[PDB]
Amino acid sequence: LLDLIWLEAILPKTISLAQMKASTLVTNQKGLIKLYFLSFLITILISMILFNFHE
Amino acid sequence: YLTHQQKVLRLYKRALRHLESWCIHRDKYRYFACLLRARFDEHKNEKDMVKATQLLREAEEEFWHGQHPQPYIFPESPGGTSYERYECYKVPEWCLDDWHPSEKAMYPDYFAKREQWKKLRRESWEREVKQLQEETPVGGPRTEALPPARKQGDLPPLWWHIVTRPRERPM
Amino acid sequence: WQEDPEPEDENLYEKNPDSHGYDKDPAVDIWNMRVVFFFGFSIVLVLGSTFVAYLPDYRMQEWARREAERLVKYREAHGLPIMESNCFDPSKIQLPE
Amino acid sequence: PKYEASRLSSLPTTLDPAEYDISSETRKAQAERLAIRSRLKREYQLQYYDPSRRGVIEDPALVRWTYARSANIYPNFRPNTKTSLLGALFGIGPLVFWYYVFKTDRDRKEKLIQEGKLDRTFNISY
Amino acid sequence: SWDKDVYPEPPRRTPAPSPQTSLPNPITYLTKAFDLLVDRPVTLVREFIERQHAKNKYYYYHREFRRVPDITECQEKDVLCMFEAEMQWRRDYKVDQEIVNIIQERLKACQQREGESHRQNCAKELEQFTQVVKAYQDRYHDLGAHYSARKCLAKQKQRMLAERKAAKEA
Amino acid sequence: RQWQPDVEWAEQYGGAVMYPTKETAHWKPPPWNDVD
Amino acid sequence: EPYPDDGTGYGDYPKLPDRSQQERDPWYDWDHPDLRLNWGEPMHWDLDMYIRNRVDTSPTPV
Amino acid sequence: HAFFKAMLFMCSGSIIHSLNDEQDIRKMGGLFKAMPFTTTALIVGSLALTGMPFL
Amino acid sequence: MLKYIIPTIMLMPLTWLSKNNMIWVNSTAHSLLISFTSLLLMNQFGDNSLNFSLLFFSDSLSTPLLILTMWLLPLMLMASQHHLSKENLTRKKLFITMLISLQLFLIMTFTAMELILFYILFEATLVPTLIIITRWGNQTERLNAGLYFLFYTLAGSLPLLVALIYIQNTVGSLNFLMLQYWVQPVHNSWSNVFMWLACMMAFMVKMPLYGLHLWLPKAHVEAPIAGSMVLAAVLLKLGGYGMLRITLILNPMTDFMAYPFIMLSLWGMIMTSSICLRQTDLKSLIAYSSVSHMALVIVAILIQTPWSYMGATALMIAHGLTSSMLFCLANSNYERIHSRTMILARGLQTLLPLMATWWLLASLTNLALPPTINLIGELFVVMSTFSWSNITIILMGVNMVITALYSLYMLIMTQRGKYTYHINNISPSFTRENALMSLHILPLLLLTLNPKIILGPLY
Amino acid sequence: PNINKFFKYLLLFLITMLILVTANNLFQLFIGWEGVGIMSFLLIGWWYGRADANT
Amino acid sequence: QLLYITSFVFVGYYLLKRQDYMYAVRDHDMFSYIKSHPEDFPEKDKKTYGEVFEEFHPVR
Amino acid sequence: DKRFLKLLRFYILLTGIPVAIGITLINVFIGEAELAEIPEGYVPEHWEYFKHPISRWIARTFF
Numbered sequence A: 001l002l003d004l005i006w007l008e009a010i011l012p013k014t015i016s017l018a019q020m021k022a023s024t025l026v027t028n029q030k031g032l033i034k035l036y037f038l039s040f041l042i043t044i045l046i047s048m049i050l051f052n053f054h055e
Numbered sequence B: 001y002l003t004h005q006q007k008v009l010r011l012y013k014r015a016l017r018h019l020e021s022w023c024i025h026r027d028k029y030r031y032f033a034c035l036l037r038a039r040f041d042e043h044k045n046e047k048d049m050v051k052a053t054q055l056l057r058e059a060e061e062e063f064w065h066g067q068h069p070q071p072y073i074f075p076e077s078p079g080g081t082s083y084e085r086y087e088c089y090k091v092p093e094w095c096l097d098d099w100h101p102s103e104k105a106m107y108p109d110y111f112a113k114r115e116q117w118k119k120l121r122r123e124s125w126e127r128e129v130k131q132l133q134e135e136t137p138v139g140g141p142r143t144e145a146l147p148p149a150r151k152q153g154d155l156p157p158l159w160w161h162i163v164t165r166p167r168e169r170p171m
Numbered sequence C: 001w002q003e004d005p006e007p008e009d010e011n012l013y014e015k016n017p018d019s020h021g022y023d024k025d026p027a028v029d030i031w032n033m034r035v036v037f038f039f040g041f042s043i044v045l046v047l048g049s050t051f052v053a054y055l056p057d058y059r060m061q062e063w064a065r066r067e068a069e070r071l072v073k074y075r076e077a078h079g080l081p082i083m084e085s086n087c088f089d090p091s092k093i094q095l096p097e
Numbered sequence D: 001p002k003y004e005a006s007r008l009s010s011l012p013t014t015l016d017p018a019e020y021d022i023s024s025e026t027r028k029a030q031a032e033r034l035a036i037r038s039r040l041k042r043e044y045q046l047q048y049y050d051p052s053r054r055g056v057i058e059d060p061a062l063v064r065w066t067y068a069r070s071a072n073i074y075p076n077f078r079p080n081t082k083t084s085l086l087g088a089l090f091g092i093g094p095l096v097f098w099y100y101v102f103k104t105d106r107d108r109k110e111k112l113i114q115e116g117k118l119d120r121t122f123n124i125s126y
Numbered sequence E: 001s002w003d004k005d006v007y008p009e010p011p012r013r014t015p016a017p018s019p020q021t022s023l024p025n026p027i028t029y030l031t032k033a034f035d036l037l038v039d040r041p042v043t044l045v046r047e048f049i050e051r052q053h054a055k056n057k058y059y060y061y062h063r064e065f066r067r068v069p070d071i072t073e074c075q076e077k078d079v080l081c082m083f084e085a086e087m088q089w090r091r092d093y094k095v096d097q098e099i100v101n102i103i104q105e106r107l108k109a110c111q112q113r114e115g116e117s118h119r120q121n122c123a124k125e126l127e128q129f130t131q132v133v134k135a136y137q138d139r140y141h142d143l144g145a146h147y148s149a150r151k152c153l154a155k156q157k158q159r160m161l162a163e164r165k166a167a168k169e170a
Numbered sequence F: 001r002q003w004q005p006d007v008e009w010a011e012q013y014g015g016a017v018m019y020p021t022k023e024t025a026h027w028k029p030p031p032w033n034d035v036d
Numbered sequence G: 001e002p003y004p005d006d007g008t009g010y011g012d013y014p015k016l017p018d019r020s021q022q023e024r025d026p027w028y029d030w031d032h033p034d035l036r037l038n039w040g041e042p043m044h045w046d047l048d049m050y051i052r053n054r055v056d057t058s059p060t061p062v
Numbered sequence H: 001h002a003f004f005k006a007m008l009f010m011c012s013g014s015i016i017h018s019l020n021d022e023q024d025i026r027k028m029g030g031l032f033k034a035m036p037f038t039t040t041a042l043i044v045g046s047l048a049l050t051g052m053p054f055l
Numbered sequence I: 001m002l003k004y005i006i007p008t009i010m011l012m013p014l015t016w017l018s019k020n021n022m023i024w025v026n027s028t029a030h031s032l033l034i035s036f037t038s039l040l041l042m043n044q045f046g047d048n049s050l051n052f053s054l055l056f057f058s059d060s061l062s063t064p065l066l067i068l069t070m071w072l073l074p075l076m077l078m079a080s081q082h083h084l085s086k087e088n089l090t091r092k093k094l095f096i097t098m099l100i101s102l103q104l105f106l107i108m109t110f111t112a113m114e115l116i117l118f119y120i121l122f123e124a125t126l127v128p129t130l131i132i133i134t135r136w137g138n139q140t141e142r143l144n145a146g147l148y149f150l151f152y153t154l155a156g157s158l159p160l161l162v163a164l165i166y167i168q169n170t171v172g173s174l175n176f177l178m179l180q181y182w183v184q185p186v187h188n189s190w191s192n193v194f195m196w197l198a199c200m201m202a203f204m205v206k207m208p209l210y211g212l213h214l215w216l217p218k219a220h221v222e223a224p225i226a227g228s229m230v231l232a233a234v235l236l237k238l239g240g241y242g243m244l245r246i247t248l249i250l251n252p253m254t255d256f257m258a259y260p261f262i263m264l265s266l267w268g269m270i271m272t273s274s275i276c277l278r279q280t281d282l283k284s285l286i287a288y289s290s291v292s293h294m295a296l297v298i299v300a301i302l303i304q305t306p307w308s309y310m311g312a313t314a315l316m317i318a319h320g321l322t323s324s325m326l327f328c329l330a331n332s333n334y335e336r337i338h339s340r341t342m343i344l345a346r347g348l349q350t351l352l353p354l355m356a357t358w359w360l361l362a363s364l365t366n367l368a369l370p371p372t373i374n375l376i377g378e379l380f381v382v383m384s385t386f387s388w389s390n391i392t393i394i395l396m397g398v399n400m401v402i403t404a405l406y407s408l409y410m411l412i413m414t415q416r417g418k419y420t421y422h423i424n425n426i427s428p429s430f431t432r433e434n435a436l437m438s439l440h441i442l443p444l445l446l447l448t449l450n451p452k453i454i455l456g457p458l459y
Numbered sequence J: 001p002n003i004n005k006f007f008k009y010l011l012l013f014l015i016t017m018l019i020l021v022t023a024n025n026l027f028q029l030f031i032g033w034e035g036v037g038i039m040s041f042l043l044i045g046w047w048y049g050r051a052d053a054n055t
Numbered sequence K: 001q002l003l004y005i006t007s008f009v010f011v012g013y014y015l016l017k018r019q020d021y022m023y024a025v026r027d028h029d030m031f032s033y034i035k036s037h038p039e040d041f042p043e044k045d046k047k048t049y050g051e052v053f054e055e056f057h058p059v060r
Numbered sequence L: 001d002k003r004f005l006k007l008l009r010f011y012i013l014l015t016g017i018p019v020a021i022g023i024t025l026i027n028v029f030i031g032e033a034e035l036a037e038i039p040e041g042y043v044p045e046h047w048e049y050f051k052h053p054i055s056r057w058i059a060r061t062f063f
Ligand SMILES: CCCCCCCCCCCCO[C@@H]1O[C@H](CO)[C@@H](O[C@H]2O[C@H](CO)[C@@H](O)[C@H](O)[C@H]2O)[C@H](O)[C@H]1O
Pocket: A011, A012, A013, A014, A015, A016, A017, D074, D075, I144, I147, I148, I151, I152, I153, I155, I156, I212
């Protein structure tokens, strides 16, 4: 119960699953010029309106 | 798995041995052992089996109540005081293969006969396997029994570890 | 698929009944036994044990007892306490407040 | 007085009601069990008796047992009320229980030392 | 071979033999057999060794440590002064452990020597052990594994503060 | 003897990605010489 | 019969009767006589607890 | 207790040896004359154990 | 330390320039000579440590660990050379290079003054050890074992790097001699709670602390014999050595911050001892024995008393030889039956008489039979923790009952009873194996005559 | 066939008792205390092929 | 092989020269600045441990 | 097993016997040093603060 199960789950086994799912989100991209540059517009807009990086 | 006869006879032997533990004295044992046998003969010819099974079950219930909490056990039987006592002295024969030649030199005659046994085993193995192959039904054996040698000059299959096993008093 | 079959468990005593277990070659096997035994036992374990047994007063435990005897002899002969609760002279201390 | 079987004291076979009332579909079951045991016994013996064999007769049953007792446990785990509560009860429960036992003891002891009440007349080894 | 003031021994008082029996004492004859068969050959061997030692006489000395300023006189964070001060403290700590050992040895020898009268006849020994332990406890107890002259000085100043506070409240 | 990777282990690293998902189930390894 | 499919990591390992090896027939010629096991037969999950040196479950006269 | 207890074990060892490693008293019996010296030491030790005066 | 560093480096050209058939003779012979010279390190003083230069110093703590480290290299070579017999020559020399380089990093790790220099070499021991496990391990799971081992260590050692660098920014130095005189008390605040954790968690995972130990049974089951020996004998003790040093600058926050880790150790030692009673893998049983033994060391370092530090130092040395011996005993059986299952080869005393004597002697030291240094160290920790809190005697007493149970249970299972019938390749013990065993136990028992040299600076 | 080793164990078993009985300090007493316990284990389990003896 | 050793030493010698020069410059700048702003770097009045009060923390 | 024990015994005694003889002849024909007060103006060498000749020799040579 403790060693071969719970002490694994609370740390190494959950951390591994999190990074694997973050990686799929990051890399599962359509490869389209149009979509990448659209996010550039969002990043620039959010930089100004929300974070005032221009000030 | 046993038959009705086997169960009755096993109960009879077990009942007498516990009765012996209670009685202790041989004269007192001989008296009660005959009374017990008389109980078994009262129903020796009970050919109505369903009644016979009831008799056996009630006899086992009567045994469990009346057994000796500390019955006699032969010293070398399972649970006896000498059971497995000599297992530490039983060394398998294959250990002699690893003797240094200077150790083997101390028993020139013994190690010569040992070669003849190893020679006999090697020349026998091929035929032993074949006999088992052709004597076993299609779907492997249905039982643990093994056959004898069916020809002269053949040894019974799978004989080595029965024949060369350690002695009960190896040292 | 092309893969070699697994080898066979080789018994060193088979080809060299006097093998020490160190090498297939009997001559290398005997030398490897000798360096281990001579350097392992005759040097490090024997001479190293003697070296440790004769260390010059390890961490001045011998000196401490001799010094303590000198201080006990002196203090009891001058009507002084053998030991005081104060490690440092209060004349050299200034308490707050 | 019947026999009260327990976890650590089994019902004797001679008192088992199913031991006597042996039907036929149970005889066939027993014969099928003996068939498996005899098939495995023959497989073992052909290797055990082989004159040319020097080694360990590997037992898949033993490998399955040692494997199930470790590598196979986590992939079959599922966090749920029985597994979470058990891990909850025992993973942290003892650690908290012992923390308050020792914390209570050391608090109380340090209190007496502050008040110069605990006796340490010859306590100079620690 | 040891200082009899550091390791005192009371004068010994053995009664003289005073037999009330006509039988021979087996102890006396074994004592004479032991003297002739054991003590004498042992003694001759020693005098031979002691003669070899006489031909080659050489001396070793007891190291003497000049006193240096202690931690109380060291400025903060001055390692060069702090090092010498704190080496001196450790050396004194080692000697004070050995002083307690001497007093404990005196106590233990008295308990055995005085026999069934030890409780009454070792009163002086017990008192000295009680005092030296009290002084040692005041100096060095509760410092911890990472003890230093600084932590020892801090402990003393806390004690001196409480002792002052009591006197003020007296 | 010592275990070394076999084909089954090797193919874990032969795909277009390392963690197949519903989104990338149609991806393929690019051409060997980068020519399509 | 596998152990019940709760979280516990049994998988499909068989659930066999919770009985000590001391309870087996000592007269049958076992492959491992000291353990009273046959080569190839499925081993109890808690076999290392049921060896003859440890927990006994034999019927008692009381 | 050291004296007669050790004798009692030595005496039982004598009987156990003579009866081919049989330690059950139900399978003994009738040894008073067959093993005289063992019988003597067995009686003395039993009387010493039970506090027979002046043993 | 150059008189030990340079000859350790020279073992690399010696191995590579040796005759092809003499690599094991040359490296073993000259590594034993290095170990011989390592006894000069016992020029310790009552008040001062032995400060060689601005980079390296040795005291009563590092000296016994240095001697154990240098003793272990020749023993590891003898243990490895059989199962590597069919390896090609270049890859044997590379294996020996990984062992030599590990010794190089270890003898600089235990002697560094600067805590950053200690950190760098302390971390550099990962690379040789990870390579030894993952390249020369036998099973498929050796790759996962290396990953667990790698990332458990780094998860804690990177916060340590940040904490150590922060300390030098504020204090101005990380030299251990300076720290003894410039140490200021650590006052309560959430900042210091996390400085304390950063300074200690890296060493806790190496010990390992109960709850952060799962990497250790995995690594041992997969490592080769030389990997197991250095892992158990010395690599675990890096965590203990670091804590004994780093606890200097964490007072008085250790007074209370140690409670959760004392609770994990006091309960964790009973759990890992009980777990040993049900382990089927012999190497895994010995791995779980290390966790239980190192639990005492963690408690000893945390309570910070003169008696507990002396116990901790003796325990670390004593466990080093005992655990290494047990792994070698398990290996010798494995080299015959090629399995780690404890219940596989039984009744081995009937077939290997002398080797059973080594099993008995190792088992008696593991369960701390007096007056072995295993009991000297354990007893000192028990005395000190009783003063810490009298109730601790209950847990320490229970752990001594269970420890004797699985120690002798291991001996009974593998050495006694009936031999397995089908296992008929149990060849007589080689001189190499018997010598390997006597070079563990003999020094271990000889230290009983002069325990003081393994009791550390608090002696 | 191991009578020589049996007598060595009996002598060791006696030596540790005399360490126990002459000990003047508790650490030395503990050596004898644990020593007799270990020699008991080795002698009680003399016939080590027998499971009941090891138990 | 000779050119590999020579090339590293030849380049390494001038890198060591510049390295030692840059650290010398850093010390030069540091001490000049300290000497130009004595108000920010006062020579502090140190006390001895007899006068300084440090809280004692018993270990027990 | 017997071969190993003969080899182990031989190599321990290979240097053990000379050391036991060497220690005996040193203790017999050289002996320990006699404790004396440091004469005025004298500065003993660091190895002269030790008693046994083997300990003194270790101090001179290595420490
Ligand atoms: C608290 C301080 C230390 C914390 C350390 C936390 C970081 C993670 C350390 C372990 C690193 C393991 O890294 C990766 O983990 C996953 C499991 O999660 C492993 O994967 C393994 O478990 C999964 C799930 O059980 C299996 O499906 C898979 O077959 C198996 O390979 C990977 O083989 C390993 O590459």
